[PDB]
Amino acid sequence: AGLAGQSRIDASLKASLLRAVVERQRALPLVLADDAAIRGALLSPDRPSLDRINRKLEALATSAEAAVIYLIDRSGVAVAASNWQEPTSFVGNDYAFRDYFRLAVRDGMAEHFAMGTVSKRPGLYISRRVDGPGGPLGVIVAKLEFDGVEADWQASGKPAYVTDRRGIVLITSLPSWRFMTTKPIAEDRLAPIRESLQFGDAPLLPLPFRKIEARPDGSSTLDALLPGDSTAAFLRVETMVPSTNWRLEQLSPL
Amino acid sequence: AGLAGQSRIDASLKASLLRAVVERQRALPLVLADDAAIRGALLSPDRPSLDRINRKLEALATSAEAAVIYLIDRSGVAVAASNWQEPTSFVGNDYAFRDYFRLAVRDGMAEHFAMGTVSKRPGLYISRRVDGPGGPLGVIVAKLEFDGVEADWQASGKPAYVTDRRGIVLITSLPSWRFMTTKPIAEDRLAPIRESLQFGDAPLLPLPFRKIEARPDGSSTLDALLPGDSTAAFLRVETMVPSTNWRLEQLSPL
Ligand SMILES: [Ca+2]
Ligand SMILES: [Ca+2]
């Protein structure tokens, strides 16, 4: 009964890093939503305005370690992007129907975890409205991908993964386990989830766990196959990721 | 060698986290210092101008979880601040000779660790030069405090602290170790350091470590005096905190 706590801090440590890596990101849209140059662009856009920003956002994505940062207009169209030089440049796409647009518009801020339309590449989409006098002038967006955290967490050998409240493995030190489940889903909500995750493909097959028995703590004994590794005795702890509505779980070996 | 692995990783983690927390703040001056309304406010000390900038910084700092974000003009007087409504408002205060001001003028930027000059709140002061034409118009400063990271650390059960290159502890899981040192310092270089921490009471003695064996690991066993007592034995690891000039040392028990 001695791994319990040890794994329990290991987990609080993981959640914690993940809090901070999300917050690191969140600042970008935060400063950018008020930015006079961002603002300028949206009232009176012209070719040099939008170029300055394309670069301002290019340098920022680099320094912020963001996958993509892009500015969307009032209509839902992307106007400037970090990836503007890429063939995958998001400049000109229609995001009007994405929740990170519409929720940023309704609320001032929004965050939604999804699969890039073309990238098939998982991310937390973070957003903020840009206020106009009059009213909304557009939305700014930053995409956090989490290969860095995941490669941190592989580096422990307590494997770990993060679920949203529907029980869905969004972020994982074990690639294969991305998008499986902790909780039972039923008929009704299977296709709808696909939808929002932009991964109609998704398995929603449950992580290969047998012999779940809840030790007093709400920590659990556990038999897992890993990618490897036919079968394996293990310990499961949980923690809430502060600043998010995600859950973290760490399996400790024996 | 069993503790070494365990502690090598945990410390690596502890840095990464520190990295994410520092980096969260780095971005605000990064952007603030280029923001036309930052500029205007410094070239047009208007009162609408300063009005706005005040809650602008209030809002950003609150979200940012920066402890204070404030804006100094060329003469060093601070002109708008997150905290314009607490009695501890930095507004009208002279910071003309603080290094964070002075070096951001001479160099473009500066990060400087020091005690709150009225608070006794230790923190990083992350500063950026507002250029104009004709030369610099002022500096924008975001102060990062470390109480949250110190509390994540208290929780881990492996005391850890960060030293600059001077050998001084700045961030520490054990509060009474603040401004204790790795290397002895000499009598008359105390003055200038106390003068720069903005803390004449900086104890600046060597950490109370004894009986150090350096390993083949380049980890080291040591005996430490625990605040209160007793002296427990510890394994010590070292890692550079990535993208700072800071260094983290972490003690794990036996
Ligand atoms: Ca969330
Ligand atoms: Ca540094």
Strand B209-214 versus strand B220-225 pairing type: antiparallel
Are A152 and B13 inside 8 Å of each other by CB? Answer: yes
Which positions ≥6 away from B12 have C-beta within 8 Å?
A: A152, A155, B239
Total length of chain A: 254
CA distance B6 to A156: 8
Domains in chain B, CATH or no CATH each: 1-64 (6.10.250.3020), 65-145 (3.30.450.20), 146-254 (3.30.450.20)
User: If you search the block for the tokens 């009059």, which residue do you land on?
Assistant: A134
Kindly state the tokens that stand for B90.
């930095």
Cα–Cα distance measured from residue B20 to residue B120, given in angstroms and rounded to the nearest whole number: 24
Return the half-sphere exposure (C-beta side, CA atoms, 13 A cut-off) of residue B244: 27
Which amino acid appears at position A210 of this protein?
Answer: R
B19 CA distance to ligand 2 middle (Å): 10
Q: Which residues contact A111 (CB under 8 A, 6 or more apart)?
A: A100, A124, A125, A126, A127
Ligand 2 centroid – CA B39 distance (Å): 27
At which residue do the structure tokens 């969260």 appear?
Answer: B24
Burial class (CB in 10 A: 0-12, 13-18, 19+), B245: exposed
For the record, the structure tokens of A15 come out as: 């959640």
Q: Of all helices (H) and strands (E), which one includes residue A69?
A: strand A68-73
Counted across chains A and B, CB pairs separated by less than 8 A come out at 79
Instruction: Return the residue of B nearest to A17 by Cα.
Output: B17
| Cα–Cα distance measured from residue B155 to residue B178, given in angstroms and rounded to the nearest whole number | 18
DSSP character string of B119-149:
T--EEEEEEEEEEETTEEEEEEEEEE--HHH
Contact criterion met (CB below 8 Å) for B113 and B99: no
CA distances from A202 to A145, A169, A178, A191, B230 (A): 18, 11, 9, 9, 55
The data reach a resolution, in angstroms, of: 2.8
Determine phi and psi for A230, rounding to 5 degrees.
-10, -65
Q: What is the DSSP letter of B189?
A: G
Q: For residues A203 and A212, is the Cβ–Cβ distance under 8 A?
A: no
A53 vs A248: CA distance, rounded Å: 37
Q: How far is B64 from chain A (nearest CA, A)?
A: 6
| Alpha carbons B136 and B220: distance in angstroms, whole number | 48
Q: How many residues does chain B have?
A: 254
Residue A203 tokens read as 């398995």
Name the residues around ion ligand 1, CB cutoff 5 A.
A 244-245
**Alpha carbons A125 and B37: distance in angstroms, whole number:** 28
**Partners of residue A60 in chain B, C-beta under 8 Å:** 27, 30-31
CA distances from A178 to A7, A199, A245 (A): 22, 11, 18
Residues of A in contact with B52 (CB under 8 A): none
Q: Are B119 and B125 in contact (CB under 8 A)?
A: no
Alpha carbons B137 and B78: distance in angstroms, whole number: 12
Encode burial over B107-140: b for 16+ CB neighbours within 10 A, e otherwise: eebbbbbbbbeeeeebbbbbbbbbeeeeebbbbb
Name the residue with tokens 């923190």: B123
Chain A residues with CB under 8 Å of B64 CB are 27, 30
Q: Which ligand has an atom closest to residue B19 CA?
A: 2
Residue that is written with structure tokens 């009471």 in the block = B201
- What technique determined this structure? X-ray
Of A116, A79, A68, A76, which is closest to residue A94 (Cα–Cα)? A76
Quickly tell me which residue has 């169209």 as its tokens: A77
The tally of CA atoms less than 13 A away on the side-chain side of residue A172 is 18
- Give the integer Cα–Cα distance in Å for B144 and B129: 18
Q: Is A219 in contact with A213 (CB distance < 8 Å)?
A: no
User: Are residues B156 and A36, on separate chains, in Cβ contact within 8 Å?
Assistant: no
Q: What is the rounded distance in angstroms from the CA atom of residue B160 to the CA atom of residue B157?
A: 9
Residues of B in contact with A156 (CB under 8 A): 9, 13
Q: What are phi and psi of B233, to 5 degrees?
A: -95, 155
Q: Which residues contact B72 (CB under 8 A, 6 or more apart)?
A: B78, B79, B95, B101, B138, B139, B140, B141
Token representation of residue B157: 């059960």
Q: Which residue has the tokens 């970008």?
A: A28
